[PDB]
Nucleic acid binder design. Structure first.
Ligand SMILES: [Zn+2]
Lengths: 109, 358, 97, 85, 94, 94, 109, 81, 98
DNA sequence: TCGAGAATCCCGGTGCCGAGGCCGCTCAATTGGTCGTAGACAGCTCTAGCACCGCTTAAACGCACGTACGCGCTGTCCCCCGCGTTTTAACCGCCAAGGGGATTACTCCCTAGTCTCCAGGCACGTGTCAGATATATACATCCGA
DNA sequence: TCGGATGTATATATCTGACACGTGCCTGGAGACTAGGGAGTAATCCCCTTGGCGGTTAAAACGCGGGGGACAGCGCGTACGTGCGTTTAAGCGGTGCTAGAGCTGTCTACGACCAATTGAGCGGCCTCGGCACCGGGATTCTCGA
């Protein structure tokens, strides 16, 4: 017989898929032959980063009494930090606005 | 009847406690001012107001008081300890600037023992500086995290100071189905409550040497105060342009019954007012209408409360109102025979006109 | 008459616009400009809508960046106004000329 | 009605430049900013649309889709998030 | 009619763990999707080049770890690396 | 002892046509070699991506032509393109 | 029999090799399968660009009476133009110096 | 081990760099800032080069490593490999 | 009476001379010592090939020269001829390195 | 508008060491067939772009007043340039040892390739709750007297 | 310092449409197996790095006098902000057409792959002339009177 299937995402305790990442790595033509340990590691890294962004944006959203998330909140969460702002220092986010910032000399006496 | 006389006496006790409460507030406010002036890692500590009336506080002697000192902490992560969500462990996520409590870490976990040790040391140093009123710190009691102040002006008052961490993140997943007031006060009020911070108080489990002094329990004192003071389906309930109910009077009567039995029978040591509050929260949820608590019917409401508690006693099951899987009446927390004893005492009092109130 | 002194409505408008998120250039004039520019490189081109929207968002972001850096230069020289010498200096430093 | 167009750059009004500047955080715009801003905008739009049209012409099409513009931007270090990719 | 492949469901799952009662509007889904695609592309490309530099012709986990150590700035690196290791360990035991 | 592959001889041949009596010092050879490698890498990478965008899986001359039209700025493009066409034509006739 | 070999560089009238470029394209993993027209076109483009740089540098070298070529001359030839300077606007050339340039305000009255 | 080598970047060296840059009147507080800027730049480049080496299991930071570390930050260097 | 050029004349002669040579402007050995000291913190007992040190030196010279060009432009922009640290900080803030 | 002086450019002679050509040879490019698939191409379906019409009203346009800011002129005084004399350490040349880079042989385990089958994820359709909006307030801030 | 005016934050009531979720189904991911070559490891060779010594002279360090540029202050006038009343055209909702994007079904030419053959390019030489260097003389640009 064939034992019951158990998806790799289960065997690694992750959330992003690991089959799909492996297919992309194989058919994107990055190298001749992809080892079998790479997709797990890469899926873990992606999952961590997405968790980070979503947590920060959610806190900033719940701050001003909203239930959903809109791009303004993503812009706030990304631009406020110190590391995440360096990783995305070139990227424009549609409908994001800017950060409240007035210089010190313009303000009246 | 006996109940109304008891209510009058309970109320007159506030007169006997007011001055002690005032001295306590004076000393505490001095300490808070001092703590906020000095430069240290505890500079942001503040008093959490939890109520001082008989309804808010636990059973206590008239000259004993408690206050909670809260502290802010950034981006904590909670890991479960039991299977019932009855205890939690604290770790830190990524911090860009630099963890200001880095040196209070033991491995990956914050050590409550070290933090309380520093807290106690700081309290001892500052209490030495109170010069106008004789305030000292009671010798540390092994197994109790409170730092207990002794104030003599000239009568002795004891004040247990408990440090509590304050967190602004999401409410923990365990609390997902807690606070079921969807039909009682509408979902909007429930959401506006759940959009608030939560507190962590150090507490050791009785489960062996491992992790002693590294465990914390949840505190929701703020939501409970809010609900207690905004308790009607009608916005004017118990307000100056509304009608009074006997909700708090019934609560006070049952709490005082427990107080008197616990005084008479030290066998009942493992019961506390939080068990009563949880039970009565369930009762206000099952029967939400104000008309079920007309003051004319005060005594009848109390009797219907008694029957519920006996059934809680008989099934040995009382789910925490905020943590539904947390059974406050589990075998491991309260021996069956103590509950049988309490059942016998409650039935005796209820059938003999509550002579223990005499 | 209740005239505000000069330089007070400006700060109110700054406090407002740095807080919304909508677009600031009208739409149809931008569409007409884009088509006019594209006529030189090919003939009879049809644009999807979202392509026009993407172009508009990119241009808005670019100009906002340019003015903010220009303002920094203008303050640097003990001034409060901005004049084209400032813009030309900022673009020369950033490496686009 | 394939009407050729002429002098549309005046469509970028004066209050539009004003509002962009206000979001930028300035306080006293002078009077000669407008011409220079229009020139800069024209240069930027030319430089993007040329690459968009090349990407289209390679695929033998006539509809400049959004993904084309996203790729033309990304080639110049101005990655755009939120329109497909 | 063919069909396209996205990361909507996975992002939604991860959101339902760190904020168990807040939803997400479709625009934010588009942004998060594009973000995931972009980061994955950067890391894959860097690892591919780095493996080619030493004449190898494979992609071991070690190369992905070095690529992560090169891209992410500062403390992120540390934390992210640990996660990977832990996961792959739990994968090997089974 | 293995051996490495460079572009010294070809650059020298091309130099001997447009300046038939001037030599080149070894440092300039190193610079010209690195320059050739870099340009070839940029063009190849751009063409590879561009072919991948339309789901193809090959590299026709057309893709190389479009990549050249994208990289080189201004008039260079025109001239360079013509050269390519001419050459490939003379290759097909034979 | 087998006819006499005739290298592809001859059949195209070029100077850079076309076999070597084809091998690099095949074993660099840029795409799954390389057409047969690409290497000729690419070699032609590379040859044109190298001819351009070498011609300009040679003129600048022969200007000041030198027979060989040294990196200073390459720096001069590259930086002087208008297109070639935009294509190499990031690249540092070892031992290249800079272009003689003094501002107008510093010079005396 | 070594300590306080950043004073090795003398003051006339900075003068000569500025003079090549096209500057006329250097002030007196420039030096204490140029040293910090140089230290930051070298820190970044050398960290990336050491990572590139340590991946290949060696102990000799070769020229190609530094060239790759530079090229990553958009500062391509022609003339060493 | 000794012959003395007025201020601001030797400077122009030195500019004209240095914009015309190619040799390096930082002495070798101090730069080598500094590089080794900096690399001390990321690993222990490293060994540098010579050409690696040379490459690092060339890159650093090029970076600093670019920085001084741009800061001089800023300094002239504000009606001066002397560069001051605020100029450098402004130039680096604009070029996106902060 | 001139002399006097310091710095630079040009020119002729000397020595050396790096660029330039020559010789084996060996490993990669070419010739010659074969085959299995990716790309070309015709034919069809139907979504999305373009074109237009009438209107309701929010934004642009033009103008008048006047006040704060840019620009220019003067002065003053301290900081940085030019030059000279002493002192420090960089450079150059030459040993001498040995750690580690580079190469060769060989073997084994990890990944590609196939077949089968079965569940996770995508298109689609539906209902209700979160947010947009309108209106009436209460509260915070700016200006002239 | 206050009052009066204007502007903005907050609370309450109402509609509506998008998002969160079932439901059906299909194609790609997992299990199970086999075959072959990439890389892992040991053993050896030899070159490039470190380390040191001793002399020679170029550059750095220090001190001094002084001319000039940075900075603060004051005064003047034009030009950009603020508010008001008029006029232009952008949204908006709705039709109506059709060009071209996208899909499907067949068939042909062309790039990979293999095997044998042979000459182009690379490493290792030798050799001499292009340039670095040296010393003298002619040209020139700056400064004070
Ligand atoms: Zn009530």
């Amino acid at each position: 017989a064939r034992a019951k299937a158990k998806t790799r995402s289960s065997r690694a305790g992750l959330q992003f898929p690991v089959g799909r990442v492996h297919r992309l790595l194989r058919k994107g033509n990055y190298a001749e032959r992809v080892g079998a340990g790479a997709p797990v590691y890469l899926a873990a890294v992606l999952e961590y980063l997405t968790a980070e962004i979503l947590e920060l944006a959610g806190n900033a959203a719940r701050d001003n009494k909203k239930t959903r998330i809109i791009p303004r909140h993503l812009q706030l969460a990304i631009r406020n930090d110190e590391e995440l702002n360096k990783l995305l220092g070139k990227v424009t986010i549609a409908q994001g606005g800017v950060l409240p910032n007035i210089q010190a000399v313009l303000l009246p006496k | 009847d006996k109940l109304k006389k008891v209510l009058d006496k309970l109320r007159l006790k506030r007169k006997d406690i007011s001055e002690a409460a005032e001295t306590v507030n004076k000393v505490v406010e001095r300490l808070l001012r001092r703590m906020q002036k000095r430069e240290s890692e505890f500079k942001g500590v503040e008093q959490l107001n939890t109520g001082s009336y008989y309804e808010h506080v636990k059973i206590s002697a008239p000259n004993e008081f408690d206050v909670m000192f809260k502290l802010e902490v950034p981006r904590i992560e909670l890991q479960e300890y039991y299977e019932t969500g009855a205890f939690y462990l604290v770790k830190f996520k990524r911090i860009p600037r630099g963890n200001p409590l880095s040196h209070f870490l033991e491995g990956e976990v914050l050590s409550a023992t070290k933090m309380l040790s520093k807290f106690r040391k700081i309290i001892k140093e500052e209490v030495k500086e109170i010069k106008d009123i004789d305030v000292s710190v009671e010798k540390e009691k092994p197994g109790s995290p409170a730092v207990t102040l002794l104030i003599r002006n000239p009568e002795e008052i004891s004040v247990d100071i408990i440090l509590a961490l304050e967190s602004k993140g999401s409410w923990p997943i365990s609390t997902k189905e807690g606070l079921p007031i969807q039909g009682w006060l509408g979902t909007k009020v429930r959401t506006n409550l759940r959009r608030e911070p939560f507190y962590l108080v150090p507490k050791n489990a009785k489960d062996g040497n491992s992790f002693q002094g590294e465990t914390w329990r949840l505190s929701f004192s703020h939501t409970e105060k809010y609900i207690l003071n905004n308790h009607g389906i009608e916005k004017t309930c118990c307000e100056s342009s509304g009608a009074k109910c006997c909700r708090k009077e019934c609560l006070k009567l049952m709490k005082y019954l427990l107080e008197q039995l616990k005084k008479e029978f030290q066998e009942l040591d493992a019961f506390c007012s939080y068990h009563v509050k949880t039970a009565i929260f369930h009762m206000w949820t099952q029967d939400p209408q104000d008309s079920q608590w007309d003051p004319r019917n005060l005594s009848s409401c109390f009797d219907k409360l008694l029957a519920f508690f006996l059934e809680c006693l008989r099934t040995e099951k009382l789910d925490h109102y905020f943590i539904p899987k947390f059974n406050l009446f589990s075998q491991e927390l309260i021996d069956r025979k103590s509950k049988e004893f309490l059942s016998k005492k409650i039935e005796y009092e209820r059938n003999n006109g509550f002579p223990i109130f005499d | 008459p209740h005239r505000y002194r000069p330089g007070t409505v400006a700060l109110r408008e700054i406090r407002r616009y740095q807080k919304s998120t909508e677009l600031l250039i009208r739409k149809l004039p931008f569409q007409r400009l884009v088509r006019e520019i594209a006529q030189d490189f090919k003939t009879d081109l049809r644009f999807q809508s979202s392509a026009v929207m993407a172009l508009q968002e990119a241009s808005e972001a670019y100009l906002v960046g340019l003015f903010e850096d220009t303002n920094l230069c203008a303050i640097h020289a003990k001034r409060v106004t901005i004049m084209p010498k400032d813009i030309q200096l900022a673009r020369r430093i950033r490496g686009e000329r | 009605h394939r009407k050729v167009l002429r002098d549309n750059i005046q469509g970028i009004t004066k209050p539009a430049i004003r509002r962009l500047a206000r979001r930028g955080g300035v306080k006293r715009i002078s009077g000669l900013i407008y011409e220079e801003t229009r020139g800069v905008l024209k240069v930027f739009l030319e430089n993007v649309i040329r690459d968009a049209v090349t990407y289209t012409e390679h695929a033998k099409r006539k509809t400049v889709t959004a993904m084309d513009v996203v790729y033309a931007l990304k080639r110049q270090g101005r990655t755009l998030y939120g329109f497909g990719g | 009619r063919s069909r396209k492949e996205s990361y909507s469901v996975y992002v939604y799952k991860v959101l339902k763990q760190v904020h168990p009662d807040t939803g997400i509007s479709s625009k934010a889904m588009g942004i998060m999707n594009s973000f995931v695609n972009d980061i994955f592309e950067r890391i894959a490309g860097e690892a591919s080049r780095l493996a080619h530099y030493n004449k190898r012709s494979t992609i071991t986990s070690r190369e992905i770890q070095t690529a992560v150590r090169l891209l992410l700035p500062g403390e992120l690196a540390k934390h992210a690396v640990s996660e990977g290791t832990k996961a792959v360990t739990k994968y090997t035991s089974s």
